[PDB]
């Protein structure tokens, strides 16, 4: 009411320096607890999500629905644990379980 070849941008060119709390801390999207932002790790997004919809399901789901979801989560976690157990670190890989890719990972990941 009142030269220089710069490869990286300058920090003064930044925007989004707001004073309104409604605009600084913007409430992220919770796509019904089932949609995730692209690129980011799915497990990280699951861990850091607001967990509001998990409470909503645990409050609204019937006993049979709870059993169904528990069984599905059991199977999915079993598959994930199999993948993790299979994905043993090259050194962690058992002597006999060290394949050619595991030996290459042990040779490359080590400092020697």
């Amino acid at each position: 009411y009142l030269r220089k070849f710069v490869f990286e941008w300058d920090a003064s060119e930044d925007t989004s320096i707001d004073y309104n709390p409604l605009y600084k801390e913007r409430h992220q999207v919770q796509l019904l607890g089932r949609g995730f932002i692209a690129g980011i790790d799915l497990k990280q997004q699951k861990r850091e999500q607001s967990r509001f919809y998990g409470d909503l399901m645990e409050k609204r789901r019937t006993l049979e629905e709870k059993e169904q979801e528990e069984a599905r989560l059991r199977k999915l976690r079993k598959k994930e644990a199999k993948q993790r157990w299979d994905d043993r670190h090259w050194s962690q890989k058992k002597l006999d379980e060290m394949t050619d890719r595991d030996w290459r990972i042990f040779r490359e990941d080590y400092s020697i």
């Binding site: 300058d10 930044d14 796509l31």
Partner: protein, 105 residues
């Protein structure tokens, strides 16, 4: 209008299923008298009574309805590998809340 498409997580569940996300509806008519002589001919049945209500690949199609543009289609024209920006939608959206100053710029 807010698309209220409920994404299905459990494939075993029926395609047309009352997901807990949907708010349950609190239940509670000049009807004709039952004693009347209305009869339905034997040739008459529901239009697709034999047709199953849902199939194993029905929820997949309903999900494909609301997919991003390259997946909303079923027929299309081939594009150059140059012409496809794999990460254009990434910076077209809002920057993630916790990020350093250089990535925001």
């Amino acid at each position: 209008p807010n698309v209220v498409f409920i994404k299905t997580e459990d494939p075993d569940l029926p395609a047309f299923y009352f997901d807990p996300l949907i708010n349950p509806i609190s239940h509670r008519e000049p009807l004709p008298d039952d004693d009347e002589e209305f009869e339905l001919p034997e040739f008459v049945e529901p239009f697709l009574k034999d047709t199953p209500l849902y199939t194993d690949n029905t929820a997949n199609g309903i999900a494909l309805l609301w997919a991003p543009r390259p997946f909303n289609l079923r027929s299309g024209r081939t594009r150059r590998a140059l012409d496809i920006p794999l990460v254009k939608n990434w910076y077209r959206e809002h920057c993630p809340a916790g990020q350093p100053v250089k990535v925001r710029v």
